[PDB]
Write a protein that binds this DNA or RNA. Sequence first.
DNA 1: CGTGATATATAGTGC
DNA 2: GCACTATATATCACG
Lengths: 50, 50
Amino acid sequence: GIHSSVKRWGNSPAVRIPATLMQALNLNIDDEVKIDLVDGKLIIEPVRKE
Amino acid sequence: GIHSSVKRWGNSPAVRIPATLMQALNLNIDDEVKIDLVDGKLIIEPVRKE
DNA sequence: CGTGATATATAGTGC
DNA sequence: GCACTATATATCACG
């Protein structure tokens, strides 16, 4: 895919996610994504607060 | 795992990755991660260019 | 033409 | 206190 790079956000790094893709997963700003360690990779799953 | 708030980095959203997680997978700033779409979730895996 | 992306700074709070 | 969290701005590069 796109060769995007992870830059530093003030102090801690942040994975810049294309706003276009955010709409595909149906999530928005302030969303609580659950970072779980699976297969030695970062599984980012958006957890809705209903 | 750890739930993080996807805030707005300027105009684009970004998944904040705590330094604690950086040390875990031995990744750093200015690295390249493969943003894959599996299970309707964001698959973030560090793909070092070495 | 508009906003999505990049760079950057800061005050504050919980870990 | 430091990592972490929340917020705001200028400017461009891309759609």
